[PDB]
Amino acid sequence: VDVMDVMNRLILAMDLMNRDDALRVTGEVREYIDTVKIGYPLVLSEGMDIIAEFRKRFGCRIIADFKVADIPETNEKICRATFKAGADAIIVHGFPGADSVRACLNVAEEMGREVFLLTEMSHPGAEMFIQGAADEIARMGVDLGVKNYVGPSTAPERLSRLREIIGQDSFLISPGVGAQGGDPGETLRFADAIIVGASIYLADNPAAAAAGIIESIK
Amino acid sequence: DVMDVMNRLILAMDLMNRDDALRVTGEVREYIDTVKIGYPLVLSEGMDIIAEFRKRFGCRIIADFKVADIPETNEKICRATFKAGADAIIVHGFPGADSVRACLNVAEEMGREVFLLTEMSHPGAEMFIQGAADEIARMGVDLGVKNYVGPSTAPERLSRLREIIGQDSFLISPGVGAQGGDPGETLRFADAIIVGASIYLADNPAAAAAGIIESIKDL
Numbered sequence: 001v002d003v004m005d006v007m008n009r010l011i012l013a014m015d016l017m018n019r020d021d022a023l024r025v026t027g028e029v030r031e032y033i034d035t036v037k038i039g040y041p042l043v044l045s046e047g048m049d050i051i052a053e054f055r056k057r058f059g060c061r062i063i064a065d066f067k068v069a070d071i072p073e074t075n076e077k078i079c080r081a082t083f084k085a086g087a088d089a090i091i092v093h094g095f096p097g098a099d100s101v102r103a104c105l106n107v108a109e110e111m112g113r114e115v116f117l118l119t120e121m122s123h124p125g126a127e128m129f130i131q132g133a134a135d136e137i138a139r140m141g142v143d144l145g146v147k148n149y150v151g152p153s154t155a156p157e158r159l160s161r162l163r164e165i166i167g168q169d170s171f172l173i174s175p176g177v178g179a180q181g182g183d184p185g186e187t188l189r190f191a192d193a194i195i196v197g198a199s200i201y202l203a204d205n206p207a208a209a210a211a212g213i214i215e216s217i218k
Numbered sequence: 219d220v221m222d223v224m225n226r227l228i229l230a231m232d233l234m235n236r237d238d239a240l241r242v243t244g245e246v247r248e249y250i251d252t253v254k255i256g257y258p259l260v261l262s263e264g265m266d267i268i269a270e271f272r273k274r275f276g277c278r279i280i281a282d283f284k285v286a287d288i289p290e291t292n293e294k295i296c297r298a299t300f301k302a303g304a305d306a307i308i309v310h311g312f313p314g315a316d317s318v319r320a321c322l323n324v325a326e327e328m329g330r331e332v333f334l335l336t337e338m339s340h341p342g343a344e345m346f347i348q349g350a351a352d353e354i355a356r357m358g359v360d361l362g363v364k365n366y367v368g369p370s371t372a373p374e375r376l377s378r379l380r381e382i383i384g385q386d387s388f389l390i391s392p393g394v395g396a397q398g399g400d401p402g403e404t405l406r407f408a409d410a411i412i413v414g415a416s417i418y419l420a421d422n423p424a425a426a427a428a429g430i431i432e433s434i435k436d437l
């Protein structure tokens with residue numbers, strides 16, 4: 001169906017692990033972004049309440065990057081807890097199979113939230129097992145009506161293939177830009193938005209880093 | 219040398235509120251010294267629940283977080299988890315060797331354990347995990363991983379996993395009870411069984427745990 005709009009096509013990966021730094025750095029770049037990806041590094045350090053804190057302080061969409069990868073019954077519980085904490089969307093692994101994905105879709109439909117299917121990863125180890133399964137995982141998502149996908153900026157031809165599988169109407173976001181070597185502009189040939197973590201949050205000047213990224217893709 | 223689990227029985231504590239989780243665990247505390255805590259409880263009550271279990275029950279805690287990210291992020295997850303007091307963490311092997319090593323690095327630094335999840339118990343595991351499982355297990359063996367998780371619901375797969383990891387490795391196995399796995403059959407290959415809802419949702423959890431141990435008193 002209709003997919004979300006991400007301001008400036010840029011999603012902040014907020015993986016700092018203390019609340020003060022996470023809030024401060026996010027504050028520094030709040031003018032450039034309306035969507036923040038929060039994962040386990042921050043949540044396990046500060047608690048699930050950090051999600052509602054971000055939404056209230058910044059008025060942003062929160063994607064919970066929890067790479068959900070359990071059996072269906074447990075996946076439903078994880079999704080329910082996560083959406084109860086205010087997350088707008090959750091990222092789910094496809095490698096555990098269709099029942100595990102459907103469990104997440106069920107909860108997202110009930111609660112009016114979104115699932116992102118992680119089809120392929122950005123790190124070298126992804127080549128061992130994930131890469132060979134990635135096209136089939138993406139097709140599994142398409143066949144189940146998944147609208148939102150995550151694929152790797154560090155493998156542009158794989159990202160291009162993913163876009164071909166999911167079609168032009170699906171929403172695609174892509175990590176590995178900056179620290180992992182992915183290029184903002186090239187990634188946006190295929191992705192609707194890029195995800196950027198440390199090259200912003202570890203920068204001497206995070207606002208300048210975000211502004212520079214946006215300048216390069218204006 | 220690997221850990222010893224009292225009565226070869228690990229409680230999967232997947233209740234999602236603190237009072238029920240603590241109470242039910244209290245009911246069965248005499249039967250077990252090792253509890254597996256996952257995201258259902260942790261995301262509902264906070265990471266402080268791990269230290270609470272260790273202090274109240276004196277148990278080993280396995281954090282079932284199915285860690286499945288890039289190496290940099292895996293390191294962060296493991297550090298947060300071990301800082302919260304977890305004795306061990308469960309890590310997926312499907313994201314590959316660098317991602318597993320990141321977890322081993324932190325576990326070595328902090329004096330804790332990694333369990334490698336090689337194969338899963340639910341039907342969807344057939345789609346992608348099953349075909350990779352022997353290679354994931356071999357990857358673990360080649361990296362010196364000593365602790366493994368494999369499925370009670372696929373006994374011949376569990377047997378194959380034991381053949382790959384050898385007799386000296388430690389193997390725990392979920393899917394017993396609710397998912398149809400049998401305690402005794404599973405313990406032919408696994409060092410311990412993991413049991414969740416068939417204990418924690420029972421009308422009488424202590425009776426359920428006692429019944430399970432009674433059925434394996436022989437082993």
Ligand SMILES: O=c1cc(O)n([C@@H]2O[C@H](COP(=O)(O)O)[C@@H](O)[C@H]2O)c(=O)[nH]1
Binds near residue numbers: 013179180195198
């Ligand atoms: O394939 C993937 C999937 C991810 O979610 N990620 C996540 O995206 C972020 C990347 O951060 P960074 O820009 O600092 O490399 C991290 O939160 C990481 O866990 C990734 O790097 N590769």
Ligand SMILES: O=c1cc(O)n([C@@H]2O[C@H](COP(=O)(O)O)[C@@H](O)[C@H]2O)c(=O)[nH]1
Binds near residue numbers: 368
């Ligand atoms: O392959 C696997 C791996 C698991 O960790 N688990 C976990 O083991 C537990 C099984 O609980 P139960 O006995 O209620 O089915 C759950 O916490 C689940 O997430 C599993 O069921 N299958």
